[PDB]
């Protein structure tokens, strides 16, 4: 659907490869640069929201 706020749209989209994988920023704790201005609390493992 053209509506970017719809669950179907934001579900049926797959991330590109190379940005995040088991080699980037190896050996350090460093949040991804392109994932800093995105709600860490809008996560499926938000324990409060799950409860």
């Amino acid at each position: 659907p053209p509506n970017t706020n719809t669950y179907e749209y934001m579900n049926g989209r797959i991330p590109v490869s190379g940005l995040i994988d088991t080699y980037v920023n190896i050996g350090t704790r460093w949040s991804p640069d392109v994932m800093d201005n995105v709600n860490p609390f809008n996560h499926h493992r938000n324990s409060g929201l799950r409860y």
Binding site: N25, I26, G27, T28, R29
Partner: protein, 50 residues
Amino acid sequence: RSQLLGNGRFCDFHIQVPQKFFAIRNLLLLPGTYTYEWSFRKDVNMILQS
């Protein structure tokens, strides 16, 4: 401690080192002018840890 200054063989460190001497670290220094010369170790085994 190793991730604070990053990964990689080479790195640039910006550290703050405190005063640990018992008679100095808590001293309330009165007005005046004092020389505070200290010597920092450069031994690699003692500075770093693996």
